[PDB]
Structure 1
Amino acid sequence: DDGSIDEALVTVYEEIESADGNITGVPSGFTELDRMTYGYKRRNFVLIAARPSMGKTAFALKQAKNMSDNDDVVNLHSLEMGKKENIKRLIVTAGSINAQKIKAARRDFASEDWGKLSMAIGEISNSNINIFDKAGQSVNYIWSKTRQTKRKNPGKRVIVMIDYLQLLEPAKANDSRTNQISQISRDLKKMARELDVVVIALSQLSRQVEQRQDKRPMLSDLRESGQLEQDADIIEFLYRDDYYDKESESKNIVEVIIAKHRDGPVGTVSLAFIKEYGNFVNLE
């Protein structure tokens, strides 16, 4: 294994001729974000960070299903929620069913929504969404499962989604908190690279965001982590203006703020958020 660039040099040039304007990598399914990125690349470590109530989980699951629809394979590592809980959200979003009606009282509170439910259960059943809901998971643990998934899926690009990074078991229990998050971050990127997968980690943000006038997240908000902004190729913040100002002129808009982009443009992408369904609508 020398450092020969010859075979890489030809594949790069080949990809340039193939560059017709369509999405190369794995699509998020949000048109205008895929325009900026051209899809997630087999090596990418992407971070979705937001304060509570900005739509983070809904947004990640939306993506998960959108990628599943390209027939890519999604491994969701959900440390916060059980599979049951993830699956109900997936159903609610897919079939445009209401969460309270479904929550219980589906046996009565539901109309002719059963065609939707069976349509929705059909789609989730024939999807490439895996869920790993064990409360305690290290990157090592996730490494193991990603390979295991790779082996069981031939030519398929795997996407590793982590329901929130700061819940992961750090490698060294006695390390400082910052060092633990630093290690988790390095290892997640190494895993993305070494196994050749997209890693998508959800991340919380400092509550200090909210004792600012303008509560749009910035890169400095990733305080308690440090390493996190350095390792990620893509960092998408979510901000929902009408959580903060109740007569915002941006009612029901979630903006995806691309705060870091290694191989491309930064900027903001707005989406219409359908609260009741945990769905997102592309804007022009």
Structure 2
Amino acid sequence: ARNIKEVLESAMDLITENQRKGSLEVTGIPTGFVQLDNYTSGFNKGSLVIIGARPSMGKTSLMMNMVLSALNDDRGVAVFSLEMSAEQLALRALSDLTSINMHDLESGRLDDDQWENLAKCFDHLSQKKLFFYDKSYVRIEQIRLQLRKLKSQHKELGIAFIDYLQLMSGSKATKERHEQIAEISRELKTLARELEIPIIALVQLNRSLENRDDKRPILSDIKDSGGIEQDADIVLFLYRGYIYQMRAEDNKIDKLKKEGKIEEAQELYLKVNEERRIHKQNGSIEEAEIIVAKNRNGATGTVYTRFNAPFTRYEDMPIDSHL
């Protein structure tokens, strides 16, 4: 009755409709952030993700949040710490799990509710398939070697984190002769594809970036003599505008006291220091930004999030819930 063209166009409509229906689906490992999952569709196999940040942006803690999200999914996750002991990284994780302050937790001075809670999270985390490497300044050949070995040993391995890659600039760069970022990320991308896992690499951004008026990192900031990095599928930048506002305030006051305007410099100091009292009183919770600066085959943008400073924690929440 109905001919093959009417049927086919209709069958095409069927799969297009399924496609539509399944388009916001998270195909990869959950990020821990729903908005971030919406952009990236999670951390996918063969993907190289770079997270770039200046110091003070809480990059290591954000990573451990993502590590936890990966563990919940029942994936085995590997974590490479170039400049930090695995212990410190575990502590950051236990802190997220127990909501116990990093300062209180590390001091070991805890109340009984806290120990009980800590003890339960300890046993929980202990059952998870998490592999730390905290030998300092390992080269990518070495990193690559360990993952190959790790992957063959554990089929469940599904993601690796690296914290962090430093950017060399100037005399240091010339004298130091480190592997360059564009080459590194080039080999990491090859490794991701080879092992068929996502690789997330933290990169500590250069200070020079801050000469700029707008101190939000840019894609070109991930570079050194040797070129701008080009091989990551996704690039996230961590930006705490509150840290830079705080420094802008301190700087302006000083400026003002210098040049002999005690009248205003004192007024600004008075105003600024009252903004900070209320801030710390309200829990030291600020508005931060996770910038999706690059997303191969995807949308680009900024996810606005709440940064809980005392827990060094970016808030996961939907755009609607935020607001």
TM-score bin, normalised by smaller chain? 0.7 to 0.9
Could you tell me whether the CA contact under 8 Å between 1:181 and 1:225 is conserved in 2?
no
Give, in angstroms, the shift of residue 112 of structure 1.
Answer: 2.5
3-state secondary structure, aligned to 2:66:
helix
Distance 2:71 2:126 in 1: 11
Equivalent residue, structure 1, for 2:116: 115
The answer as to 2:239 corresponding to 1:244 is: no
* Cα pair distance change 1:188/1:175, threshold 3 Å: farther
3-state secondary structure, aligned to 2:315:
strand
The answer as to 2:60 corresponding to 1:57 is: yes
Amino acid of the structure 2 residue aligned with 1:254:
A
Give, in angstroms, the shift of residue 17 of structure 1.
Answer: 9.0
Distance 1:31 1:111 in 2: 34
Distance 1:62 1:145 in 2: 23
Distance 1:175 1:63 in 2: 35
Equivalent residue, structure 2, for 1:183: 183
Could you tell me whether the CA contact under 8 Å between 1:185 and 1:227 is conserved in 2?
no
Q: Larger Rg: 1 or 2? A: 2
Amino acid of the structure 2 residue aligned with 1:230:
Q
Distance 2:225 2:121 in 1: 38
Give, in angstroms, the shift of residue 251 of structure 1.
Answer: 5.3
Equivalent residue, structure 1, for 2:42: 39
Give, in angstroms, the shift of residue 175 of structure 1.
Answer: 9.9
3-state secondary structure, aligned to 2:113:
coil
Equivalent residue, structure 1, for 2:308: 274
Distance 1:140 1:76 in 2: 16
Amino acid of the structure 2 residue aligned with 1:53:
S
Equivalent residue, structure 2, for 1:82: 85
Distance 1:178 1:145 in 2: 20
Aligned residue pairs total 265
Distance 1:55 1:166 in 2: 15
Equivalent residue, structure 2, for 1:9: none
Give, in angstroms, the shift of residue 226 of structure 1.
Answer: 5.4
Equivalent residue, structure 2, for 1:24: 27
Distance 1:68 1:271 in 2: 23
Could you tell me whether the CA contact under 8 Å between 1:79 and 1:167 is conserved in 2?
no
Amino acid of the structure 2 residue aligned with 1:114:
W
How many percent identity over aligned positions?
Answer: 37
Could you tell me whether the CA contact under 8 Å between 1:42 and 1:197 is conserved in 2?
yes
The answer as to 2:153 corresponding to 1:149 is: no
Distance 1:207 1:29 in 2: 29
Deviations 1:2-46 (A, max 9, x none): xxxxxxxxxxx9x95993632111111100010111111101100
Could you tell me whether the CA contact under 8 Å between 2:54 and 2:204 is conserved in 1?
yes
Distance 2:91 2:55 in 1: 20
Distance 1:132 1:18 in 2: 41
Could you tell me whether the CA contact under 8 Å between 1:40 and 1:198 is conserved in 2?
yes
Equivalent residue, structure 2, for 1:195: 195
Give, in angstroms, the shift of residue 227 of structure 1.
Answer: 4.8
Q: TM-score, normalised on structure 2?
A: 0.74
Give, in angstroms, the shift of residue 187 of structure 1.
Answer: 1.0
Distance 1:159 1:235 in 2: 16
For structure 1, the 5+ residue unaligned runs are 1-12, 169-173
Give, in angstroms, the shift of residue 98 of structure 1.
Answer: 1.4
| Mean Cα deviation higher: 210-219 or 236-245 | 210-219
Give, in angstroms, the shift of residue 111 of structure 1.
Answer: 4.6
Distance 2:305 2:225 in 1: 28
Distance 1:225 1:218 in 2: 17
* Cα pair distance change 1:128/1:105, threshold 3 Å: closer
* Cα pair distance change 1:226/1:272, threshold 3 Å: farther
Give, in angstroms, the shift of residue 178 of structure 1.
Answer: 7.6
Distance 1:145 1:178 in 2: 20
3-state secondary structure, aligned to 1:214:
coil
Distance 1:77 1:54 in 2: 19
CA RMSD between the two structures:
3.0
Give, in angstroms, the shift of residue 104 of structure 1.
Answer: 2.0
Deviations 1:164-201 (A, max 9, x none): 12389xxxxx9984863332221111111122121111
3-state secondary structure, aligned to 1:89:
helix
Distance 1:177 1:196 in 2: 30
Could you tell me whether the CA contact under 8 Å between 1:178 and 1:226 is conserved in 2?
no
3-state secondary structure, aligned to 1:39:
coil
Could you tell me whether the CA contact under 8 Å between 2:47 and 2:193 is conserved in 1?
yes
Q: TM-score, normalised on structure 1?
A: 0.83
Which residue, out of 241, 250, 254, partners 2:288? Answer: 254
